[PDB]
Design a protein around this nucleic acid. Structure first.
Ligand SMILES: NC(=O)c1ccc[n+]([C@@H]2O[C@H](COP(=O)([O-])OP(=O)(O)OC[C@H]3O[C@@H](n4cnc5c(N)ncnc54)[C@H](O)[C@@H]3O)[C@@H](O)[C@H]2O)c1
Ligand code: FES
Ligand SMILES: [K+]
Ligand SMILES: [K+]
Ligand SMILES: [Mg+2]
Ligand SMILES: [Mg+2]
Ligand SMILES: [Mg+2]
Ligand SMILES: [Mg+2]
Ligand SMILES: [Mg+2]
Ligand SMILES: [Mg+2]
Ligand SMILES: [Mg+2]
Ligand SMILES: [Mg+2]
Ligand SMILES: [Mg+2]
Ligand SMILES: [Mg+2]
Ligand SMILES: [Mg+2]
Ligand SMILES: [Mg+2]
Ligand SMILES: [Mg+2]
Ligand SMILES: [Mg+2]
Ligand SMILES: [Mg+2]
Ligand SMILES: [Mg+2]
Ligand SMILES: [Mg+2]
Lengths: 58, 122, 137, 48, 97, 86, 74, 128, 72
RNA sequence: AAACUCCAGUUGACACAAAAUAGACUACGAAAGUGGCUUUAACAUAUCUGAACACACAAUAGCUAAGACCCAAACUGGGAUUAGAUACCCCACUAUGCUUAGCCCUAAACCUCAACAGUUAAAUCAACAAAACUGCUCGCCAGAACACUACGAGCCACAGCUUAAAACUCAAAG
């Protein structure tokens, strides 16, 4: 269920203080955000640590 | 008005619990209160450890006291409960039955807000 | 029956036994994954210290101290000492959201300690002290 | 009607004469305020 | 004139207004079993109205009763009482999935 | 501190599947909002900044839910073109 | 796009013309520059669907009003 | 103030309440009640004493009495809570409204106006 | 219309009829419509009680053989 | 790097500080503000408008006296960076944030959109923003800068607050 919007913004008929202060109009656009690439990180650190540990011992 | 006292007595024996209950009710009567009824919620482990009167309590006995007292006696009874060493916790609240329940017809739907922005073409 | 993710509360008469020991008898492994260090201490059910390891104790210094590889190295060392003193199963209690929060448990598993439960005990004030001011980076 | 209903309830109030009896009766008896609710909206009493 | 013209009437097919599960039932701070149904079993946080499904009034009463019970020693704060974990589930939330 | 131990935020490991147990616990914390609260509690956020953040999140939630509802509404029209060539 | 085939068949049978495809800009207000200097504009336009595919009024009715072409529209 | 044993205004006219148990009498008296019940009784006494036709409540003579009771209650509250700025504003506005009602009543009757002034002890002072 | 009360009542009690609506036929008559017509006919006769009028309409359909499967 | 090393981890005892979730709620108050629990007192006006100066309030910061120490932190000291760094980064510690009694009367005190009653009609409508108007009343405004300034006057304020100009300059300012 979508949160209510009545009595939230500042208008000429709203007596109460504005609950929400949007910097952009609350109007649906004709597009969606582009897919975000995943910030990859290091891989096989566990295997690298095991190999280096055995190098230290040997 | 009508107040209800929630009391958490220490996990003592039956004679000690009876004496503590008698002392507590007598203190209410001495402060001009009409004790309507006495209830026994039972003995149970406290949800959290309570340290009061230099004692660490893990189990206690929950009791309820319903009474009618003047508005100038609640504070005196609270002070008496604090000085009592056999009371782990004690709170005096307005009786829930005093406040009636207003009739509810249903969950009225909330219409979606409209005309929040002008109709000029952006 | 169905596996119970809920812990076997001592009030409940749970039949789960690990090597003849109940849930309340399994030694605890306290992991504190700070933003710059991961300190691991293994203590018995009666609050008796058994092992202790951290990034500084393993040789990592400054920024190197406080990484995932440093955390798992401390876990391996702590598990090794614990197993020498007779620890097999551990109840893991993690306190903090810093780096090496999971690597420390991985190091303990690689050391040879079996984890039977994971508990988060991160201190969350309920409206408490006032933290330091924000950074202007 | 409220006054008449209150008139009968006074007979069951705790006084300084029956205080010991009420305390003993309370210690013997038990009271439970717990009850659970369901998705259908039904009160499930704790049958113990 | 003509009797086939539509008349002025209220909607007869209108369904009754939906009611919350706690509608018409008293909420008491001593009812720990009822209060425990609206808290997180792992953290003890009070669920929002979007999860509980209660109305505005009942959500407020549940919140006040929980806070009163916790401060007076009737209800645990940091976790849900294990004895009430087998009570019927009335919240729309899934943790394992 | 004064509560019982190993009852809060505890997840049991099944068949040694520690990864699943950790993911389940992390998901539980994230859904309850503890993870985000801890991250924001590292530094003190001034009340004016906190109100602005809450207003931004509430506006973002409303827009996202409305956009999601429209997408689910229009997803029925994802079928192939009926009147191809027109 | 559901009755384009039917409407084009109707135009063939009655001997009149039809336009059920995408309406390129300037087909009426700039017809001389596209069809030819001596092109003859229609004397009547019949709309069976006054709305385009974005649920908005078609541009042909506005163009017909500009060019003083009477319109019969559903 | 009315005696604490005085019954509430709601129960002061019910038949059979004059012959009940002492517990019932003190339950329905002013002793086990809030301050609002005492104010209602004080308003009732002033209405009976000063003005006629107590049924009317929109009369300018009853509005002054009701506001005067509120003024006294605010003064009693401020006697203990001297740092209550909100109630201090409420008391001042109530005084100003009462003076405005007195001015209208003086221009309207000047006979019941004198009846109100002596009954409630209020003195009408011309502003500077 | 006046019959909208009857249709709403028959859609609540006795539920929807087994017969599927055939909106293509201009002279289609559903079970609910037949119940409405019988209710109207008995109203033309002049029965006073609305509850008795509803029950008598159900009795007439049972006599005619119309299947009346209540939801409850 | 500096600092601590009277340090760090578990457990137990353990506030005169601040009140996770509820809160996807939109309530109370004239405004400032107000969101842990209980109790008491309590939330002006039967037309509206009506005071920067009358009266009563007024976030944070600041002052005068008496108390409290968890944390944060102007100033200060040290470490680091830099050509310089009196800042941004790290550490430590004050005034201060708390309570009680008085003071000062400030804010981008703004939702920069006055109070009361009413309308959706056509030219609705410079632009943007939160669409355009009617009736009545109070306050204010009329080129920029000088100027949240000088002087005068009032104030428990004495490096202060309120009111508040002029000469000179420009054809712009917005
Ligand atoms: N100042 C008086 O004694 C007085 C007497 C009758 C009416 N008024 C009314 O006061 C308003 C202000 O008049 P102005 O422009 O000459 O004053 P102003 O606003 O220039 O203020 C100068 C003086 O008038 C006082 N004043 C201001 N507003 C007042 C008010 N509403 N009531 C009483 N005194 C006020 C101030 O305290 C100061 O002494 C007007 O509406 C006027 O009709 C004032
Ligand atoms: S719908 Fe009745 S109390 Fe919520
Ligand atoms: K809190
Ligand atoms: K603003
Ligand atoms: Mg903006
Ligand atoms: Mg050094
Ligand atoms: Mg919150
Ligand atoms: Mg006025
Ligand atoms: Mg003036
Ligand atoms: Mg101030
Ligand atoms: Mg101060
Ligand atoms: Mg500090
Ligand atoms: Mg200090
Ligand atoms: Mg005080
Ligand atoms: Mg403000
Ligand atoms: Mg302004
Ligand atoms: Mg005004
Ligand atoms: Mg200034
Ligand atoms: Mg000045
Ligand atoms: Mg001058
Ligand atoms: Mg001067």
């Amino acid at each position: 269920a979508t949160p209510s919007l009545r009595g939230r913004l500042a208008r000429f008929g709203n007596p109460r203080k504005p609950v929400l202060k949007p910097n952009k109009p609350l109007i649906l656009a004709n597009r969606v955000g582009e897919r975000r690439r995943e910030k990859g990180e290091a891989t096989c650190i566990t295997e690298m640590s095991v190999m280096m540990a055995c190098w230290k011992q040997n | 008005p009508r107040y209800e006292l929630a009391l958490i007595l220490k996990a003592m024996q039956r004679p000690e619990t009876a004496a503590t209950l008698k002392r507590t009710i007598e203190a209410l009567m001495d402060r001009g209160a009409i004790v309507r009824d006495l209830e026994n919620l039972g003995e149970r482990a406290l949800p959290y450890r309570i340290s009061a009167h230099s004692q660490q309590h893990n189990r206690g006995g929950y009791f309820l006291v319903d009474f009618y007292a003047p508005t100038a006696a609640v504070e005196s009874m609270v002070e008496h409960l604090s000085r009592d060493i056999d009371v782990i916790r004690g709170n005096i609240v307005k009786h829930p039955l005093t406040q009636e329940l207003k009739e509810c017809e249903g969950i009225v739907p909330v219409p979606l807000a409209e005309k929040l922005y002008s109709t000029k073409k952006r | 029956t169905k596996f119970s993710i809920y812990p076997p509360i001592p009030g409940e008469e749970s039949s789960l036994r690990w090597a003849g020991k109940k849930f309340e008898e399994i030694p605890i492994a306290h992991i504190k994954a700070s933003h710059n260090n991961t300190q691991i201490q293994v203590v018995s059910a009666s609050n008796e210290p058994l092992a202790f390891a951290s990034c500084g104790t393993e040789g990592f210094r400054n920024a190197k101290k406080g990484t995932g590889i440093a955390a798992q190295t401390a876990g391996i060392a702590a598990a090794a000492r614990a197993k020498q003193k007779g620890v097999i199963h551990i109840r893991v209690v993690v306190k903090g959201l810093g780096p090496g929060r999971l690597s420390a448990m991985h190091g303990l598993i690689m050391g040879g300690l079996e984890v039977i439960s994971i508990t988060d005990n991160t201190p969350i004030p309920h409206x408490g002290c006032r933290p330091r001011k924000a950074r202007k980076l | 009607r409220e006054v008449l209903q209150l008139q009968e309830e006074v007979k069951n109030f705790i006084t300084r004469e029956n205080l010991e009896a009420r305390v003993e009766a309370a210690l013997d008896s038990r009271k439970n305020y717990n009850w659970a609710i369901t998705r259908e909206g039904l009160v499930v009493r704790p049958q113990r | 004139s003509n009797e086939d013209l539509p008349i002025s009437m209220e909607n007869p097919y209108k369904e009754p207004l939906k009611k919350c599960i706690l509608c018409g039932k008293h909420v008491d701070y001593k009812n720990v079993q009822l209060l425990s149904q609206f808290v997180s079993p792992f953290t003890g946080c009070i669920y929002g109205r979007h999860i509980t499904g209660l109305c505005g009034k009942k959500q407020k009463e549940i919140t006040k009763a929980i806070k009163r019970a916790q401060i007076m020693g009737f209800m645990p704060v940091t976790y849900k009482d294990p004895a009430y974990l087998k009570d019927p589930k009335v919240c729309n939330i899934r943790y394992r999935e | 501190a004064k509560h019982l131990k190993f009852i809060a935020r505890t997840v049991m490991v099944q068949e040694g599947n520690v990864e699943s147990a950790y993911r389940t616990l992390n998901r539980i914390l994230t859904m309850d909002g503890l993870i985000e609260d801890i991250k924001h509690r590292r530094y003190y956020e001034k009340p004016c900044r906190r109100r602005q953040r809450e207003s931004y999140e509430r506006c973002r939630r409303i827009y996202n839910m409305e956009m999601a509802r429209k997408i689910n509404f229009l997803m029925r029209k994802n079928r192939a073109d009926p009147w191809q060539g027109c | 796009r559901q009755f384009s085939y039917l409407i084009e068949n109707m135009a063939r049978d009655c001997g009149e013309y039809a336009h059920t495809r995408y309406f390129r800009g300037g087909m009426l207000t700039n017809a001389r520059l596209l069809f030819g200097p001596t092109v003859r504009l229609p004397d009547l336009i019949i709309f069976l669907h006054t709305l385009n595919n974005i649920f908005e009024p078609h541009v042909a009715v506005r163009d017909a009003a500009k060019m003083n072409i009477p319109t019969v529209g559903i | 103030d009315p005696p604490p044993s005085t019954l509430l205004k709601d129960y002061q006219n019910v038949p059979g309440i004059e012959k009940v148990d002492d517990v019932v009498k003190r339950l329905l008296s002013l002793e086990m009640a809030n301050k609002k019940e005492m104010l209602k009784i004080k308003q009732e006494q002033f209405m009976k004493k000063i003005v006629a036709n107590p049924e009317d409540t929109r009369s300018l003579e009853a509005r002054i009495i009701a506001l005067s009771v509120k003024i006294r209650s605010y003064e009693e509250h401020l006697e203990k809570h001297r740092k209550d700025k909100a109630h201090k504003r409420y008391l001042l506005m109530s005084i100003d409204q009462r003076k405005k009602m007195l001015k209208n009543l003086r221009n309207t009757n000047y006979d019941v106006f004198e009846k109100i002034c002596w009954g409630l002890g209020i003195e009408y002072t011309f502003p500077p | 219309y006046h019959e909208d009360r009857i249709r709403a009542k028959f859609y609540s009690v006795y539920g929807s009829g087994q017969r599927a609506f055939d909106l293509f036929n201009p002279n289609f008559k559903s079970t609910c419509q037949r119940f409405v017509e019988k209710y109207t006919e008995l109203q033309k006769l002049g029965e006073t009680d609305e509850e008795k009028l509803f029950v008598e309409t159900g009795k007439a359909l049972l006599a005619e053989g119309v299947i009346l499967r209540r939801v409850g």
